[PDB]
Design a protein around this ligand. Structure first.
Ligand SMILES: CCCCCCCCOCCOCCOCCOCCOCCO
Ligand SMILES: CCCCCCCCOCCOCCOCCOCCOCCO
Lengths: 4, 193, 193, 5
């Protein structure tokens, strides 16, 4: 969902 | 005889530790290598309780009254720093969900929603405005490469998260250079809790 | 009797050193405070020769053959790292003249000539293009605030300096939103020596 | 002649  | 043996043991171990500290201090940054960065992180996690436990030992076996008081203050110093790190890191992680929130280097994060996913990047300098540029379908925001995004599908809002506050910035100006090229500016309008 | 005294003295000094290392490792960055940054630099400058001297001592007084060989390799490692730092720092200083060239965190520098002076800022990510935006007479390049500059007096060229090569980027696109507001894009065209 | 900020 959250990529960094 | 036995006197010299321990000297060798202590000096050997300390020499290895000193080299490790030199390496993490010289190369331990994400802009250099993530590998040495993770090593530096492991060192810091180990370093907090070691400093506190060491100062507690010196407080129990002091040289004099002044050493006792300084040892107590230094031990409380280690505790306060660990507590502070945990508080701000957890707050930023609850706000963003990114692992970048555990990086002592950055206390500002920029969240950009690309399509149905969110990409987070640490922000170098806090500001009230953020500039986005798309060239031939590739998007770069605030001078940082963010990835592949069509100029027509740019998000209306973008968020900046700090340990204490979350800020929202809405699009204001939109200029289209080409079919899939253009420039946009986001300005802040509201503060969060 | 004297046995316990040395324990007390050594443990006290080590406790102070451990606390100092925790502080520079946690707060020693320009994005947090310049004060701990200078302390961290002082620690690193001192750390190179101490590590080398420690390993040389263990090579003269080793536990066995393996300790001696490892001590030699670690000593050469300390020496090589110091030489590498000095070479890369001096090269960037000859190219830019900025003290930012002595920061192991950043090996890319952006030089912008505002009027008759030059302002240098470390660059987070290398790129072939640089975006500049001026609002009401204040200039911000690559998401970094650069200062006060009139939109009419924007530089034609801007340079990016690495330890080995210097790159020049000239203005391509120029759009004026207001009297002293606009956006410009610089792209690279030449490589240096 | 050079300001590093
Ligand atoms: C582009 C070059 C990058 C590589 C640079 C390093 C190349 C290898 O360096 C060679 C220097 O090695 C010196 C090691 O010295 C250790 C001394 O060993 C002492 C052991 O003596 C035992 C006596 O019984
Ligand atoms: C940009 C990379 C440049 C790399 C340059 C490498 C230079 C490193 O040189 C290291 C020299 O090592 C010599 C130190 O080792 C000698 C050991 O001390 C002598 C004692 O020998 C053992 C006594 O029993």
């Amino acid at each position: 969902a959250a990529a960094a | 005889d036995e006197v010299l043996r321990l000297v060798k043991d202590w000096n050997f171990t300390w020499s290895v530790v000193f080299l490790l500290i030199t390496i993490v201090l010289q190369y331990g940054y994400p802009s250099r290598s993530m590998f040495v960065y993770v090593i530096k992180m492991f060192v810091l996690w180990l370093l907090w309780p070691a400093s506190m436990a060491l100062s507690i030992f010196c407080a129990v076996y002091p040289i004099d009254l002044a050493s006792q008081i300084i040892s107590g203050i230094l031990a409380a110093t280690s505790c306060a720093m660990w507590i502070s790190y945990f508080v701000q890191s957890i707050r930023l992680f609850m706000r963003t969900g990114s692992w970048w929130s555990f990086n002592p280097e950055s206390n500002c994060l920029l969240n950009v929603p690309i399509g149905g996913t969110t990409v987070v990047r640490p922000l170098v300098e806090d500001s009230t405005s953020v500039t986005a540029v798309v060239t031939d379908g590739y998007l770069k925001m605030a001078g940082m490469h963010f990835g592949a995004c069509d100029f027509q599908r740019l998000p209306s809002e973008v968020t900046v998260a700090k340990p204490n506050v979350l800020i929202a910035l809405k699009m204001i100006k939109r200029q289209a250079y080409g079919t899939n090229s253009g420039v946009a500016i986001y300005h802040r309008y509201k503060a969060g809790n």
